[PDB]
C-alpha cells in the first residue's frame, strides 16, 4: 500500500515531467527569442 502510494506519487511526478517537457520547448523558444533579442540589440548597436 505505501509502495503503491509512492508509485502514484511517481506517476504524478511523471505527469509533472511531461508538463516540464511540454514547457521545455517554450523555454527553448524564450531562450532563442532572447538570443534573437541580443542579436537585434547587436544589429541596433551596429548602427548606434
How would you describe this protein?
This protein is mainly alpha-helical and 48 residues long. Helix content is 96%, strand content 0%. The longest helix is centred in the middle third of the chain and has 46 residues, at 2-47. The protein is rod-shaped and about 70 Å long. It comes from Saccharomyces cerevisiae (strain ATCC 204508 / S288c). Belongs to the SMC family. SMC5 subfamily. This is Structural maintenance of chromosomes protein 5. It is found in: Nucleus; Chromosome.
Secondary-structure map:
Elements: H1 2-47
PDB class: cell cycle
Keywords: cell cycle
Entry title: Cryo-EM structure of 5-subunit Smc5/6
Outline of this structure?
96% of the residues lie in helices and 0% in strands.
Amino acid at each position: 500500500g505505501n509502495e503503491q502510494s509512492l508509485q502514484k506519487d511517481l506517476d504524478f511526478k511523471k505527469a509533472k515531467i511531461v508538463h516540464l517537457r511540454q514547457e521545455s520547448d517554450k523555454l527553448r523558444k524564450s531562450v532563442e527569442s532572447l538570443r534573437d533579442f541580443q542579436n537585434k540589440k547587436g544589429e541596433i548597436e551596429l548602427h548606434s
